Amino acid sequence: YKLQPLTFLLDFSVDGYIRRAIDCGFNDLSQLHCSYESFDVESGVYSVS
Amino acid sequence: IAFNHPIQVDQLNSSYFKLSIPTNFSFGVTQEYIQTTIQKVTVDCKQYV
């Protein structure tokens, strides 16, 4: 798989090894997740690019 | 700019008192606005810059 510069929201475990990641570029929901720096965000209608 | 004088009613020295009583209904007063709400605007990221 090719590597591209991307901004990724990373969930760091207490063990210190990431088990979850999110990419802002793919999908409208991922940009909402990148906003607030949170994997889970409040339900609602949000503007997108 | 002039101060218009309101009708002047003298106070009687005697126990009996003098009062001014209206003779006509004179309806038709009106005019009020509250500005309860304002327009809602959402900024668009990336496209604006």
Nearest CA in chain B to A45: B42
List of chain B residues whose C-beta atoms are within 8 Å of the C-beta of residue A49: 44-47
CA distance A43 to B4: 62
- What CA–CA distance (Å, rounded) separates B2 from B7? 15
Q: Using a CB cutoff of 8 Å and minimum separation of 24, what contacts does A34-40 make?
A: A34/A7, A34/A9, A37/A9, A39/A9, A39/A11
Who contacts B35 (Cβ-Cβ below 8 Å, separation ≥6)? none
- How many beta-carbon pairs under 8 angstroms link A with B? 7
Interface touch B42/A47, C-beta < 8 Å:
yes
Experimental method: cryo-EM
Pick the residue from chain B with its C-alpha nearest to A31.
Answer: B45
Q: In Å, what resolution does this model reach?
A: 2.8
Quickly count: other Cβ atoms within 10 Å of residue B5's Cβ.
Answer: 6
By the 8 A CB rule, do B23 and B12 touch? no
Of B29, B34, B46, whose CA–CA distance to A34 is shortest?
B46
Q: In chain B, which residues have their Cβ closer than 8 Å to the Cβ of A47?
A: 42-44
> Are the beta carbons of A47 and B44 separated by less than 8 Å?
yes
